[PDB]
Amino acid sequence: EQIVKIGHASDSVRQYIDGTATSGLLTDYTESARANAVAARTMRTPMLKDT
């Protein structure tokens, strides 16, 4: 619930501002979120502290 709130707020702001002649000063907030999400997806179970 917290995640989808923050995401929808940020994406809506992106669609309002972007497409203007002085864009490119803005770090691509929706697409960079996509890029971050696909990078984080590779993950593994850690072993054990005792064994």
Partner: protein, 574 residues
């Protein structure tokens, strides 16, 4: 291997005086078998069967008479003894055996069935009647009467079969099904006056209060089959009153099928809605927490155009089911159970002084110090504006922000004061909004946009300068964009240049260096872009090769669009 199967399979696979003298050997075998075992009765039967075959039937009687002395409650033996006498064609003996059997065990059904069948196959049928008459004196339970009825029906005696039913209903008639089967018997023969009488007497028999309504539905459906349909409505409709909650569930399914033909305009919609109404009330008795059942119920009553006081009683019953969890995820469906009530009171009942009370009751129930529904505070505020009471509307939004300062409230309050042309009140609320949510750079922009729309440039500049001085922002890029774009709209490029200057003093990020060049490119001071590119490219000698490359592709775009081949050699040697 030779495991379980092959060992045990191998173990498995290993696995006429002479006639008179033979008969003597058999008798000794039986008699000594009897002597030891006595309760052996299967062998006692076999000895009886065996002697019979020989025409020694005279002895076989003696065997069975001895066998009956051992058990006597012997129902296997009694059957075998009679059946022996029948196959021998002894029928007066067979009668005597049955007359004893039914006398001694009057409530073993098997003898009366077998005995009546023997006499019937002999066409003794007066005697077969007397057996059934004698049987009924024992008040034998259901199957005995049904077999006597069915017997008379095979003769087609049907008025004598009717006599059996009338006596059957006297003993058994506590069970409804006997009355319904009787009425069905009269109906199918065509006696239909008897069938009406049978149902009406069944209702009179069961009474007024403990209405046996399975009779009543059966009575209704019989009259429906006749095409009495006025009667059929009457029976269903009568049932609905005395039955009203629990048993009507059966009535309504037949009553609605009934009306589905004949009801078509007025009768169908009445029964289905009233069926639906009681069906939703069942859901509410099961779980008053079923909000979807209340919404669907309230839809039905509003489309009914139900009398106002009943719909108010249903809304106020629905509303009292406050969620037990006190966390907003559960309230999201429950809150529209209040909003629909305020919409009904405002739009349909048109009792505005009662819609105030709906909202006050709503806001007195929300756990505001844990969460709020901004919808409630917004809708309650706009309602008083429709009453032209700005003082009430401001108090509502004012305590909204005072109890729970929330973004949706600020936006709604600001949009309201903007529509009211109360621009100085909007300003004070934005300052409160920024104090609430300082990191929200969008609000700093929306605050500067208000000042820009009101034509006060120096107001808008002071906001932006105070905005970019903030220690934290959700999106400085959005704010720095907005302030550059503002100074571009002012055409004070010598200050917009200063914004890139200070922004570049904050970060040597290549995209800011590109946009600084693109700014000069869009002024058409293309040498400023080259001087920026050189200032970037000659200073960023320690930047990454791709960072420099992306920087220098932007310059290569600049020179390929302008076409200066001499500069492109410089670019080619960057």
């Amino acid at each position: 291997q030779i495991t379980a199967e092959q060992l045990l399979r191998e173990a498995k696979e290993r696995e006429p005086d002479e006639l008179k003298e033979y008969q003597r050997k058999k008798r000794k075998e039986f008699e000594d078998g009897i002597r030891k075992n006595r309760m052996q009765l299967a062998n006692w039967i076999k000895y009886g069967k065996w002697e019979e075959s020989i025409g020694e039937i005279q002895r076989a009687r003696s065997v069975f008479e001895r066998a009956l002395d051992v058990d006597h409650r012997s129902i296997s033996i009694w059957l075998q003894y009679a059946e022996m006498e029948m196959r021998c064609k002894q029928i007066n003996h067979a009668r005597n055996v049955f007359d004893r059997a039914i006398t001694i065990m009057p409530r073993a059904m098997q003898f009366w069935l077998k005995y009546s069948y023997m006499e019937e196959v002999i066409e003794n049928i007066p005697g077969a009647r007397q057996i059934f008459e004698r049987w009924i004196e024992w008040e034998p339970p259901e199957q005995a009467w049904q077999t006597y009825i069915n017997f008379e029906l095979r003769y087609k005696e049907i008025d004598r079969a009717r006599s059996v039913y009338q006596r059957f209903l006297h003993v058994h008639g506590i069970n409804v099904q006997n009355w319904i089967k009787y009425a069905k018997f009269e109906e199918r023969n065509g006696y239909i006056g008897n069938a009406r009488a049978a149902y009406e007497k069944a209702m009179e028999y069961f009474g007024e209060e403990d209405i046996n309504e399975t009779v009543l539905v059966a009575f209704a459906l019989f009259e429906e089959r006749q095409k009495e349909h006025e009667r059929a409505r009457g029976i269903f409709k009568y049932g609905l009153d005395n039955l009203p909650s629990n048993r009507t569930e059966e009535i309504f399914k037949h009553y609605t099928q009934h009306e589905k033909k004949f009801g078509e305009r007025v009768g169908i919609e009445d029964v289905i809605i009233s069926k639906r109404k009681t069906q939703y009330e069942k859901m509410v008795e099961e779980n008053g927490y079923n909000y979807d059942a209340w919404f669907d119920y309230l839809r039905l009553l509003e489309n009914e155009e139900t009398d106002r006081e009943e719909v108010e009683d249903v809304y106020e019953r629905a509303i009292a089911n406050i969620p037990p969890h006190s966390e907003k995820r559960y309230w999201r469906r429950y809150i529209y159970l209040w909003i629909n009530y305020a919409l009904y009171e405002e739009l349909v009942a048109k009792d505005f002084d009662r819609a105030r009370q709906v909202y006050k009751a709503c806001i007195d129930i929300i756990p505001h110090k844990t969460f709020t529904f901004a919808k409630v505070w917004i809708m309650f505020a706009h309602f008083e504006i429709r009453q032209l009471d700005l003082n009430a509307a401001r108090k509502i939004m004012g305590v909204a922000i005072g109890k729970c300062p929330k973004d949706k409230l600020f936006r709604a309050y600001i949009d309201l004061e903007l529509q009211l042309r109360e621009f100085d009140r909007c300003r004070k609320l934005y300052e409160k909004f920024l104090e609430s949510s300082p990191e929200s750079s969008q609000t700093w922009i929306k605050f500067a946009e208000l000042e820009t729309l009101l034509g006060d440039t120096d107001r808008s500049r002071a906001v932006f300068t105070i905005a970019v001085q903030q220690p934290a922002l959700d999106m400085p890029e959005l704010l720095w964009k907005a302030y550059i774009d503002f100074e571009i709209a002012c055409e004070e490029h010598e200050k917009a240049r200063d914004l890139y200057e200070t922004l570049l003093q904050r970060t040597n990020h290549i995209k800011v260096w590109i946009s600084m060049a693109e700014f000069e490119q869009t002024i058409g001071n293309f040498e400023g872009a080259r001087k920026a590119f050189e200032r970037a490219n000659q200073s960023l000698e320690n930047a990454e090769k791709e960072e420099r490359l992306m920087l220098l592709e932007a310059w290569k775009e600049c020179e390929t669009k302008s076409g200066d081949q001499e500069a492109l050699k410089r670019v080619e040697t960057m």
